[PDB]
Ligand binder design. Structure first.
Ligand SMILES: N[C@@H](Cc1cc(I)c(Oc2ccc(O)c(I)c2)c(I)c1)C(=O)O
Ligand SMILES: C[C@]12CCC(=O)C[C@@H]1CC[C@@H]1[C@@H]2CC[C@]2(C)[C@@H](O)CC[C@@H]12
Length: 249
């Protein structure tokens, strides 16, 4: 495989447990608290993963933290969808080996509709027969799919880096598409899939935001990093100061 592909497959984070006590009844407080703890843990891996991405360190240090704090949601949801597809054939949401959501939990989580959309996204991997290489390249591009309206500290470098990752995706598609009427069609399908992630991410952004505000009333715990990011970064997205980068209108 090319060097780019070797790197993506090599830095891909391993299994991460949520530390949820399945010995406890499925309550809203317990379920969401574990989801937050999982988010905190995953965030650590995302940071290491990102800094290990080709050219990422070329971005200004401040922009490195910015893009991560804005796209972590989309990145995790996309990865979760892939796990769910690969582990339980998208039958359930495989957040973590110790935190698998079934119908009952989807309802109990008080975000059934959102879970439904994530399951659909999960199924898309199967319907479109997404390859492991395509998944990796798409997930990397998600790290560069949401920035502030006023641009980053160094938009030049970000725009160049994003472009290079979009090109890498093309090669992965053109490195097997022997059919002349499937190559271009494939890029269309993948870009559409990538876009369908943002709408889902925004719904979770609004949901987690509201949950944090009334977290003390519903007995839901938010880790240090999660609480800080959801109250400082997320609001910028919900207020329209930070918007996702769509391929299609
Ligand atoms: N295509 C290559 C890997 C390859 C991947 C990427 I993302 C590239 O983007 C940049 C641009 C400016 C930089 O400072 C850095 I660091 C990286 C380049 I240049 C090459 C391979 O497969 O070996
Ligand atoms: C990103 C996580 C945790 C990591 C993952 O696999 C995807 C999943 C999507 C729902 C998120 C959850 C983290 C905690 C959140 C943000 C809850 O507060 C509400 C929505 C939850």
């Amino acid at each position: 495989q090319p060097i780019f592909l070797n790197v993506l497959e090599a830095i891909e984070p391993g299994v991460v447990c949520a530390g949820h006590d399945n010995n406890q009844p499925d309550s809203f407080a317990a379920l969401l608290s574990s989801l937050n703890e999982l988010g905190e843990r995953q965030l650590v891996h995302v940071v290491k993963w990102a800094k290990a991405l080709p050219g990422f360190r070329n971005l200004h240090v401040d922009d490195q933290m910015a893009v991560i704090q804005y796209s972590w949601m989309g990145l995790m949801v996309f990865a979760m969808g892939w796990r769910s597809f690969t582990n339980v054939n998208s039958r359930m949401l495989y957040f973590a080996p110790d935190l698998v959501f079934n119908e009952y939990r989807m309802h109990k989580s008080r975000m059934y509709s959102q879970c439904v959309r994530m399951r659909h996204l999960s199924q898309e991997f199967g319907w479109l027969q997404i390859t492991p290489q395509e998944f990796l390249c798409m997930k990397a591009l998600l790290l560069f799919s949401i920035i502030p309206v006023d641009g980053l500290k160094n938009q030049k470098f970000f725009d160049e880096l994003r472009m290079n990752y979009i090109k890498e995706l093309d090669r992965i598609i053109a490195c097997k598409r022997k059919n002349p009427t499937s190559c271009s069609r494939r890029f269309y399908q993948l870009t559409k899939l990538l876009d369908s992630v943002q709408p889902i991410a925004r719904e979770l952004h609004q949901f987690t935001f509201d949950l944090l505000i009334k977290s003390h009333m519903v007995s839901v715990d938010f880790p240090e990093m999660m609480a800080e990011i959801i109250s400082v970064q997320v609001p910028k997205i919900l207020s329209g100061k930070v918007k996702p980068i769509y391929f299609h209108t």
